[PDB]
């Protein structure tokens, strides 16, 4: 951590509700869902721990 | 309580605590002291101010007594504990002997307070060095310097703390009796010596003079900028001896 | 490792090592035996002469702790003379406040309890000194106690301390003693000493003996010279035979 | 790795005290010669700059008007001893009314030499032995005498001692130039010859202190003028 | 190596190192002999000088008018234990109006040097004594150690190369009881002359004799009071 | 014994005091705490380090202590040590009052504490007090003052400073925006909400996440009040309406 | 005998931590679970009593002590260190009551008990105390619940847990605690949140409960607790 | 975690990184160093102590090896552990008991005289300057309003009230034998109790005693003085337990 | 090395290693020659005062100086320019100070 | 005694929602009057006055050493002091000097901050608390004021009647004593305000 050694520090914060909805949409497409589905509701049900 | 022996003899024949306290001095700030014939000028380099601090609480030039002032370089904490006991001593002496303290005597007591602390149980050494400066009962100027060991010598000129080996090298060649013949030449000798170890010009040198039988005046920043203009003016009129 | 530098440190085993070591400093001293009969106590020390330059019968290991209480020591002798003064001092404060010779059951428990206070702290070192207190009274009979570095006291009918602790406890187990007059015991003591001593590990020895019983009227002395000789003649004869 | 302040070396003597002796070999040089005419003490100041006053250095101090002293080693630790010496000599004058024998003063100073003690003492006792060796030279009823006192408490009378960072070298040159029949003017000149080899800078009137103590005088330190006169002869 | 930094630790072997060491401080000290008769006790000590221009350190210290001692070890400790004895014998004059009998004096040194071999971070006194006294039991010698033991002797020697003396004294221990005063001191010197190198001898500038008797309060002899005892002395041939 | 001694009052080979130096790093974790001087009073701001839904508040402030009638201070570091130093201060300042029969001068109160913080680093072998303090005060020699003491035993006057978590980031923001003179107590509270908002990583502050206490002079007596939640909530809205109007350049 | 050590054993590390207090907080988290719930007219202090046979007599010791007519303690951690603090508190309360003739307020008592625990992280030759006290009290019309830590800090809570599984219990309480409860749940809801960390069957002699209303603090008799253990009261 | 060393932490009494005091978990191992075991059983009229008495030699007197000590006249107790520490703590009990009577004037309850032995031990835990005593006291005595009682206090402090306890080498094995005879429940007369104590010690060691191999301390409500039963009385119960 | 005080002395014994050069933090005028050397390969906007960013912070290593230069120059590459402005150095200096302040 | 050496009067008096405490002003060294204004009434918070008469030294030590306990109690605790406690607190302070006492006798007038209940009390020079509901007096004219107030009082008075009573009760009791008089000051405390009037007395 001596300034000037490592040259960039990016933070990956745990998904918020909106990001988490999108992350739920990236894996969803990998299995046969069904017409009536409300992922938005599912992401709000989750507390938001990880991807 | 806590009867331990902090300072013991090395096997090489030193005292490592009093030699380590020597380094707490070297991490200090430069302070110089030249003595004239009617005037004694000690300046401390770095006010340490950050455009937010007061200049009234960062001062490193206190006044034990009326004819006795003292500048230090080391741990600001310890220095305030010595200075206090010194001020007590300076009044205890007016009670029992009518005269005011001489400058030797308030030193021999600051030194002897620092020596006892490197030979008593429980205590680490005082990590300060000091320039005690003043005038006797005879108008004579005096300049004494202590250190953690608790030794003290007089000087004609002297510097302590950070960058003091360099400043002593400048005062060997420049302290004569072609300088310090007037009050204006002695102040200019001190400033010209700290300008060698300050890297921000003259607007960073607090400087206090004492004059014969009057009390300690600290020169406000305006007068010091006037004197720094006369120095820099004088290094462009040394171009009359290079042509 | 670091379980022996302090009396204040149990080891993982479960035992303070500094007290263990003290007791081993006793085991490397000459032997002293006590043997209580039915009307007195007799003491026996196997004092080695290490040169011919030490004066005879001097620098004893038989103290008087009180006017009716012997103390025969073994182990590091400097710490012994220290206890013998703490005990004299206790058996004086007891006559002062209660007004009568201190009972040996109590003088023991008080000198053990003082030794024990020295195995608790790190600021002090446990005594290197086991010792026996004998005594006679006409209201309590003979009593013989033995203390050690731990700070333990135990009543005894006989015991021994020092480098021949094992060989001497045998000789007393093979001896009837709840039936013998004082006068007969002294012969036994001398004989036991002579057996347990090795002149192939030590040079020679002086035999020190102490009454305290019905003979002397509840005082504690050293056996008179004539009876001491008789006990040395009867002891060379049992080594001849 | 740490031990006490009072540990014996398995060799056979006290760690600290054996060490405090080494702190002497760092100090200036002192030379004392005992005569029938008096005692002389010569000690080099060893100034470190030209900016120092060669006068606020005191390595010869009066203990009384008939007992000089010269310190080598850590001159800071002498401050406590010297002041015990004075208050000793004065108390002996306030009770018995009469000067004090030189030997008795040095004995009373040496009783502090072994007095450190990390614990089981006052919250005021020393923690470490004193770092300083002394040359008490005085004149009393035995005529002149000169004692040497080191941080071991062992004091002893000498006819001529040298201490400091030229104890080895000077001590050998005293053995060749000393003899019972001297006068004080021969000695002051003899010592400054030894002291001129073992210094590092040239011998000025500002690089030594001389003192003498004579039967018919007091302790009398030579000033900067009188020194010019005995360096002229050399 | 960890059992050597305190008097407070025992060693697994069942000794104490700090007390063993202290006694090496005694074997660094300058030889000294003590023998007795039945009317006199004598302390003969071989002083030493640490230079050519220097006097010799006093080995025999006067205590009271019937007790002498001869140190061997740190001198600063020897004058700490001498002031305590001087103080014990001025306590007896002042309370009982008698001389403190030696056996009960050596028992106080024993109680005071025991203490600091059992407290933390204090050391043993690094000095061994020979105590020549004469009271109402004739003459005595007492050897004291830094361990805090002590002994009643008929003729003891401590210091450096003392073993050489101890044998000389152990072959002649029978003759001592019948000596007149001057004959005894001869023995002591002849024993002390076996502790030197073979190259030098007893002079008047490094021998110190101390005599205490039935009618003679303890004295000390130096320089030219020692000459009436070296003169007449046998020659020691190799 | 000597084996188990830490030796906390002893120099390093380098010329430092390790325990006093570590104590600094323990202060870099406490809650942020800044103070700003003005001409018309002075104010301490500190963020509540402990907050929770169950946690309660019983006292006017959980970090601001009143040392006198005229002085308050805020602490930072080991909370336990802070209950000790603030009790000696109060007792010092009454012992001053009991002699001179005046309120104690601002500067003296501090040094008198710094003799106690400084003693602990030089002998006795106790661990030092791991606390730094800000003292806002008023006296009749200098008007309003602000001061800052360290576990070393060093103090200094300041015109605006910060101590504890992300202190160096606050001070960089104060050097720029703070004017020498020209500060009203309205303006200082604008600077104090802005500086606090930048050293704390929360999206926005809340009246329930900070504590702002001022010290004003009204009628020749001193007043030291702690702003309620409504008074601070105003300040937080007027700062979001200066970020909404700090995009009018594009 | 001895003198005593003089040098603190709690020391700063390069981190800026006082390692000894960090550890003494881990002892706290080994101790028996304890919950605290301020009501709106009383305080409930309930605790999982210790036992491990049927030989122990579960009425010879008490983990819920009375400090004053209006104060109470339970603790979590080492049982010997608890009898020391209960006994320095009861004396503090009696010096306070001897000078002002007034029962010591509960804010006061916690602030002093804490300064005793602070003294053992900066005194010679001691280790910090190994307990967390939960101090209830009802003075001046209100109830109070505090908690002092072996550090010396103290925090007012509206309900909390300590000891084993005190992170599960602070969550469980975070939801179930809606102010304006009656005094009688805090008991109910308290006992529930002991059960979220207790394995076995609760009985009248296996937990200890103490309430603290205007009428003064009082330990609940075994009979009384058996009824709240209808798990419906 | 998991037992690590904080440097010093097994040499003084400061917390480990785990959250324990290794120095006190060791002082318990001293109690078993003794090699003796003592059972104590409470009745409904009397409390009984029974101790194994081990005379190693024919030299030791047998009447001065005992482990039963009279603290008051209404308080006995049995000491297991290092015999030195033991006697040092009994001496201290007697002192407190008689100091109590002197200050309050009604002789001390068995409850409190343990609470004070407990608190003295606790100090030795909290300071580094000394080790804790390596012994374990079990007091018994009739209380004036709660029947008989039994208390046991440990080297750390923690002390509790019991119906039946043991201490020493077979401290686990005994409490498994006892708790069976406690959940059944009897009348617990005076002859019931002494019966349960001796048969517990006798089966867990396998000795089947002689009257000279145990000492039995007992305190009844009819007569609250603390007796130590002689060999004559002890034998009446041993041959009664050989019949039944 | 940067911990020299933790080396077995026998390793750095004179005659094993003979010269111990020490590297103190730069001065103020030196710290300006460093910040003047990394900026030499760049093009700075005209409002950049080198002397205001130097003194702004303190106790800089030539690694911290290059770290402030590097960051700001990068801020100019998020904008597709080549003029490091006085504000690129403010964002940068504020992201190396949290860097020094955070992660400590 | 030696509480006569200086003289002094104080006097508290309960109203029905107010309380009034009155004192003379005269610091005199035996017979010789030094100063005509020397305060024997001190604020101890609001609506709480302690009146100290007797030896003029302890009047000043006990109001200074009582301010030091009080302030160090309104800080350490946030509450403001109760009038019943300031009695127990100044009881303990006197009894601390049991042997070689102070020579003052406190009078405490005041209202309960949390209601406005009036509260008065006196103390002995050794620290005995005496709560009354009529009036309390201390001084060298004590017996003068006891008689004067016992027949000049009413169980309920308003703020205007109280100040009438205690005024005309102090003036006449203190004029019949040699070493008192020369100026009476009267605080009278309501819940709202604290009125303080000086009466015109005989300057002889």
């Amino acid at each position: 951590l001596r300034p000037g050694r490592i040259d960039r520090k990016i933070e990956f914060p745990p998904p918020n509700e909106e990001a988490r909805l999108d992350i739920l949409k990236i894996h969803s497409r990998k299995m046969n869902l069904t017409r009536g589905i409300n992922l938005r509701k599912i992401a709000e049900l989750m507390p938001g721990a990880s991807g | 309580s806590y009867d331990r022996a902090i300072t013991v003899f090395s096997p090489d024949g030193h005292l490592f605590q009093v030699e380590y306290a020597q380094e707490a001095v070297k991490k200090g700030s430069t302070a110089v002291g030249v003595r004239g014939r009617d005037i004694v000028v000690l300046g401390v380099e770095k006010k340490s101010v950050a455009k937010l601090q007061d200049e009234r609480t960062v001062r490193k030039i206190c006044a034990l007594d009326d004819n006795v002032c003292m500048a230090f370089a080391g741990l600001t904490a310890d220095a305030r504990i010595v200075i206090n006991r010194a001020r007590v001593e300076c009044q205890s002496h007016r009670l029992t002997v009518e005269d005011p303290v001489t400058v030797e005597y308030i030193t021999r007591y600051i030194a002897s307070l620092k020596q006892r602390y490197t030979q008593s149980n429980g205590r680490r050494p005082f990590g300060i060095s000091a320039l005690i400066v003043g005038f006797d009962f005879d108008g004579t100027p005096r300049l004494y310097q202590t250190d953690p060991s608790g030794t003290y010598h007089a000087w004609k000129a002297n510097a302590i703390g950070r960058g003091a080996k360099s400043v002593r090298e400048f005062l060997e060649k420049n302290y004569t009796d072609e300088a310090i013949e007037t009050d204006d030449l002695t102040i200019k000798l001190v400033i010209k010596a700290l300008l060698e170890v300050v890297q921000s010009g003259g607007k960073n040198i607090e400087l206090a003079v004492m004059r014969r039988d009057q009390s300690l005046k600290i020169l406000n920043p305006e007068e010091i900028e006037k004197y720094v203009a006369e120095i820099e003016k004088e290094k462009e009129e040394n171009e009359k001896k290079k042509q | 490792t670091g379980y022996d530098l302090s009396a204040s440190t149990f080891s993982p085993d479960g035992r303070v090592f500094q007290v263990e070591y003290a007791m081993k400093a006793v085991e490397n001293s000459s032997t002293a035996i006590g043997i209580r009969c039915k009307d007195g106590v007799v003491f026996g020390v196997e004092k080695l002469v290490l040169s011919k330059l030490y004066e005879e019968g001097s620098n004893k290991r038989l103290f008087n702790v009180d006017r009716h209480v012997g103390m025969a020591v073994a182990g590091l002798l400097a710490d012994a003379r220290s206890l013998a003064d703490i005990a004299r001092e206790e058996a004086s404060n007891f006559r002062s406040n209660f007004g009568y010779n201190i009972p040996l059951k109590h003088l023991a428990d008080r000198v053990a309890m003082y030794v024990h206070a020295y195995t608790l702290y790190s600021a002090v070192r446990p005594f290197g000194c086991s010792f026996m207190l004998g005594s006679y009274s006409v209201n309590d009979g003979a009593q013989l106690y033995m203390i050690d570095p731990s700070g333990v006291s135990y009543g005894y009918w006989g015991c021994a301390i020092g480098k021949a602790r094992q060989a001497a406890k045998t000789e007393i187990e093979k001896l009837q003693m709840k039936e013998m007059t004082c006068r007969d015991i002294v012969k036994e003591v001398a004989k036991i000493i002579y057996i347990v001593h090795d002149e192939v590990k030590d040079k020679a020895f002086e035999l020190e003996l102490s009454w305290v019983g019905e003979l002397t009227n509840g005082r504690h002395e050293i056996v008179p010279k004539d009876i001491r000789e008789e006990a040395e003649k009867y002891a060379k004869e049992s080594l001849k035979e | 790795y740490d031990r006490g302040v009072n540990t014996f070396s398995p060799e056979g003597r006290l760690f600290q005290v054996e060490y405090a002796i080494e702190a002497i070999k760092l100090g200036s040089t002192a030379i004392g010669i005992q005569t029938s005419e008096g005692v002389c003490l010569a000690v080099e100041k060893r100034i470190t700059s030209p900016l120092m006053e060669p006068s606020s250095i005191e390595k010869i101090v009066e203990i009384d008007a008939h007992i000089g002293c010269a310190m080598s080693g850590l001159i800071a630790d002498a401050k406590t001893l010297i002041d015990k010496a004075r208050v000793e000599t004065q108390n002996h004058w306030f009770t018995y009314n009469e000067t004090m024998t030189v030997e008795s003063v040095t004995q009373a100073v040496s009783n502090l030499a072994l007095q450190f003690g990390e614990e089981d003492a006052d919250p005021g006792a020393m923690s470490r032995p004193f770092g300083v060796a002394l040359l008490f030279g005085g004149v009393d009823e035995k005529g002149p005498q000169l004692f040497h006192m080191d941080p071991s408490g062992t004091f002893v009378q000498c006819d001529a001692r040298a201490i400091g960072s030229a104890s080895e070298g000077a001590q050998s040159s005293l053995q060749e130039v000393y003899h019972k029949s001297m006068t004080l003017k021969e000695a002051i000149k003899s010592s400054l010859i030894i002291l001129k080899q073992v210094m590092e800078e040239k011998l000025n009137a500002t690089n030594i202190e001389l003192a003498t103590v004579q039967p018919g005088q007091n302790f009398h330190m030579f000033t900067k003028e009188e020194l010019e006169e005995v360096i002229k002869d050399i | 190596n960890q059992y050597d930094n305190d008097v407070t630790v025992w060693s697994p072997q069942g000794r104490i190192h700090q007390i063993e060491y202290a006694m090496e401080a005694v074997k660094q000290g300058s030889a000294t002999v003590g023998l007795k008769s039945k009317t006199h006790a004598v302390l003969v000590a071989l002083k030493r000088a640490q230079s050519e221009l220097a006097a010799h350190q006093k080995k025999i210290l006067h205590v009271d008018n019937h007790i002498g001692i001869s140190i061997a070890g740190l001198t600063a400790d020897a004058r700490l234990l001498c002031n305590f004895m001087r103080q014990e014998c001025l306590d007896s004059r002042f309370v009982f109006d008698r001389p403190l009998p030696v056996s009960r004096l050596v028992s106080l040194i024993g109680s005071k040097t025991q203490i600091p071999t059992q407290r933390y971070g204090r050391r043993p006194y690094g000095v061994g004594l020979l105590i020549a006294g004469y009271d109402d039991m004739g003459p005595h010698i007492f050897q004291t150690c830094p361990s805090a033991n002590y002994f009643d002797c008929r003729a003891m020697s401590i210091g450096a190369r003392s073993q050489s003396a101890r044998t000389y004294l152990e072959r002649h221990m029978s003759e001592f009881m019948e000596c007149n005063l001057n004959e005894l001191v001869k023995h002591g010197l002849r024993a002390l002359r076996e502790t030197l190198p073979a190259e030098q001898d007893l002079t008047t500038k490094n021998v110190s004799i101390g005599i205490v008797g039935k009618d003679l309060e303890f004295t000390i002899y130096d320089d030219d009071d020692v000459s009436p005892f070296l003169e007449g002395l046998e020659e020691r041939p190799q | 014994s000597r084996r188990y001694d830490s030796r906390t009052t002893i120099f390093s080979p380098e010329g430092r005091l390790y325990q006093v130096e570590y104590a600094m790093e323990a202060i870099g974790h406490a809650g942020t705490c800044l103070g700003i001087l003005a001409n018309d009073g002075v104010l301490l701001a500190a963020e509540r380090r402990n907050i929770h839904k169950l946690l309660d508040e019983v006292f006017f402030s959980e970090k601001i202590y009143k040392l006198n009638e005229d002085m308050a201070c805020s602490v930072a570091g080991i909370t336990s040590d802070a209950n000790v130093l603030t009790n000696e201060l109060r007792l010092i300042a009454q012992r001053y009052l009991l002699q001179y029969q005046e309120p104690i001068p601002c500067e003296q109160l501090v040094t008198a504490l710094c003799d106690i913080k400084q003693a602990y680093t030089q002998f006795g072998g106790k661990r030092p007090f791991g606390v730094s303090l800000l003292y806002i005060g008023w006296d009749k020699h200098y008007g309003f003052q602000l001061y800052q003491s360290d576990p070393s035993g060093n103090y200094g006057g300041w015109k605006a400073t910060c101590i504890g978590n992300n202190s160096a980031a606050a001070v960089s923001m104060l050097k720029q925006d703070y004017k020498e003179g020209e500060m009203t107590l309205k303006s200082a509270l604008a600077l104090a909400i802005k500086v606090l908002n930048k050293t704390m990583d929360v999206s926005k502050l809340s009246a329930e996440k900070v504590e702002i206490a001022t010290l004003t002079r009204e009628n020749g007596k001193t007043v030291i009040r702690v702003l309620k939640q409504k008074e601070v909530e105003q300040l937080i809205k007027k700062h979001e309406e200066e970020e909404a109007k700090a995009e009018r350049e594009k | 005998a001895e003198r005593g050590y003089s040098f603190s054993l709690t020391t700063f590390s390069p981190s800026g931590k006082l390692v000894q207090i960090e550890y003494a907080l881990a002892a706290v988290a080994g101790g028996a679970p304890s919950v605290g719930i301020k009501a709106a007219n009383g305080v409930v202090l309930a605790t999982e009593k210790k036992q491990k046979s049927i030989l122990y007599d579960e009425r010879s010791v008490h983990k819920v002590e009375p400090i004053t007519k209006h104060i109470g303690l339970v603790y979590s951690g080492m049982g010997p260190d608890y009898r020391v603090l209960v006994h320095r508190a009861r004396k503090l309360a009696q010096q306070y009551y001897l000078v002002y003739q007034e029962p010591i307020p509960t804010a006061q008592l916690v602030q002093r008990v804490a300064s005793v625990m602070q003294e053992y992280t900066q005194s010679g030759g001691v280790r910090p105390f190994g307990v967390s006290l939960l101090i209830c009290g009802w003075n001046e019309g209100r109830p109070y619940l505090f908690q002092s830590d072996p550090s010396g800090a103290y925090f007012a809570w509206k309900a909390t847990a300590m000891g084993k599984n005190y992170v599960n219990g602070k969550t469980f309480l975070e939801k179930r605690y809606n102010e304006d409860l009656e005094l009688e749940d805090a008991i109910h809801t308290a006992i529930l949140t002991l059960k979220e960390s207790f394995e076995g069957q609760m009985t009248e002699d296996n937990i200890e409960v103490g309430i603290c209303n205007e009428a003064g603090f009082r330990r609940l008799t075994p009979t009384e607790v058996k009824d709240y253990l209808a798990a419906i009261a | 975690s998991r037992g690590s060393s904080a440097g010093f932490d097994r040499h003084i009494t400061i917390f480990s990184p785990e959250g324990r005091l290794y120095q006190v978990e060791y002082a318990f191992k001293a109690i078993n160093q003794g090699g003796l075991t003592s059972v104590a059983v409470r009745g409904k009229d009397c409390a009984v102590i029974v101790t194994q008495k081990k005379v190693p030699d024919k030299l030791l007197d047998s009447s001065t090896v005992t482990h039963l000590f009279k603290i008051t006249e209404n308080i006995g107790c049995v000491m297991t552990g290092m015999t030195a520490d033991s006697r040092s703590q009994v001496q201290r009990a007697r002192y407190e008991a008689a100091n109590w009577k002197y200050k309050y004037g009604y002789e001390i309850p068995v409850d409190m005289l343990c609470k004070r032995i407990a608190d003295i031990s606790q100090v030795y835990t909290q300071n580094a300057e000394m080790r804790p005593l390596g012994c374990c006291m079990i007091l018994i005595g009739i209380d004036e309003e709660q029947g008989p009682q039994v208390y046991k206090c440990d080297p750390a402090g923690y002390y509790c009230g019991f119906k039946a306890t043991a201490a020493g080498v077979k401290q686990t094995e005994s409490t498994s034998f006892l708790e069976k005879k406690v959940k059944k429940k009897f009348d617990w007369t005076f002859e019931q109790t002494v019966e349960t104590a001796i048969t517990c010690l006798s089966t867990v060691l396998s000795i089947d005693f002689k009257p000279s191999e145990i000492e039995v301390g007992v305190v009844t409500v009819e007569n609250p003085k603390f007796r130590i039963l002689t060999e004559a009385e002890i034998d009446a119960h041993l041959v009664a337990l050989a019949e039944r | 090395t940067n911990r020299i005080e933790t080396l077995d002395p026998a390793l750095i014994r004179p005659g094993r290693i003979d010269r111990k050069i020490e590297f103190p933090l730069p001065d103020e005028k030196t710290k300006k020659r460093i910040f003047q050397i990394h900026t030499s390969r760049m093009t700075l906007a005209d409002d950049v005062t080198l002397d205001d960013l130097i003194m702004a912070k303190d106790d800089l290593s030539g690694a911290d100086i290059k770290a402030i230069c590097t960051e700001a120059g990068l801020m100019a590459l998020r904008e597709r320019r080549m003029k490091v402005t006085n504000e690129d150095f403010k964002k940068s200096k504020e992201n190396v100070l949290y860097k020094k302040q955070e992660g400590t | 005694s030696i509480m006569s050496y200086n003289g002094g009067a104080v006097m508290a008096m309960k109203g029905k929602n107010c309380v009034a405490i009155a004192a003379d002003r005269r610091f005199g060294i035996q017979a010789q009057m030094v100063t005509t204004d020397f305060q024997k009434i001190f604020p101890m918070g609001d609506r709480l006055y302690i009146g100290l008469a007797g030896l003029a030294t302890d009047v000043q030590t006990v109001a200074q050493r009582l301010k030091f306990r009080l302030n160090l109690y309104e800080l350490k605790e946030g509450r403001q002091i109760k009038p019943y406690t300031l009695m127990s607190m100044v009881a303990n302070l006197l009894y601390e000097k049991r042997f070689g006492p102070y020579y003052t006798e406190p009078v405490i007038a005041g209202l309960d901050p949390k209601t406005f209940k009036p509260f008065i009390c006196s103390l002995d020079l050794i620290g005995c608390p005496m709560v009354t509901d009529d009036f309390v007096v201390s001084g060298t004219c004590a017996e003068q004021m006891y008689g004067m107030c016992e027949s000049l009082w009413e169980p309920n008075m308003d703020p205007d009647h109280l100040f009438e009573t205690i005024s005309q009760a102090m003036l006449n009791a203190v004029d019949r004593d040699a070493v008192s008089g020369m100026g009476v000051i009267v605080h009278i405390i309501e819940k709202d305000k604290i009125t303080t009037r000086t009466l015109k007395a005989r300057m002889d």
Side-chain angles (χ1 to χ4, degrees), chain G residues 139-194:
Chain G
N139 46 245
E140 321 313 322
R142 303 168 50 178
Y144 287 108
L145 172 64
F146 296 87
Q147 163 198 95
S148 62
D149 291 281
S151 349
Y154 62 104
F155 314 89
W157 297 100
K158 277 182 311 183
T160 188
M162 246 312 178
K164 194 173 289 179
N165 313 330
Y166 79 108
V167 185
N168 299 131
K170 285 184 68 56
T171 304
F172 178 94
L173 282 165
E174 186 160 16
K175 308 156 186 182
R176 296 217 179 200
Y177 174 65
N178 297 91
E179 299 199 38
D180 313 313
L181 300 186
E182 181 48 49
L183 174 49
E184 300 187 281
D185 0 278
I187 310 185
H188 196 251
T189 172
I191 290 166
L192 283 177
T193 174
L194 286 177

Side-chain angles (χ1 to χ4, degrees), chain J residues 139-161:
Chain J
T140 53
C141 33
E143 65 295 313
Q144 318 286 333
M145 305 173 286
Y146 272 130
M148 219 285 171
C149 283
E150 256 303 296
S151 184
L152 217 80
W153 193 74
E154 293 193 326
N156 285 271
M157 293 171 278
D158 38 317
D160 303 323
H161 278 36

Side-chain angles (χ1 to χ4, degrees), chain D residues 24-41:
Chain D
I24 310 300
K25 301 305 178 292
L26 312 175
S28 58
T29 309
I31 303 174
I33 311 172
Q34 176 210 118
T35 324
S36 322
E37 208 81 4
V39 186
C40 95
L41 306 173

Side-chain angles (χ1 to χ4, degrees), chain E residues 12-24:
Chain E
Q13 306 178 97
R15 48 188 61 184
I16 303 164
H17 277 353
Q18 275 290 292
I19 316 300
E20 287 205 340
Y21 293 168
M23 285 180 303
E24 302 283 314

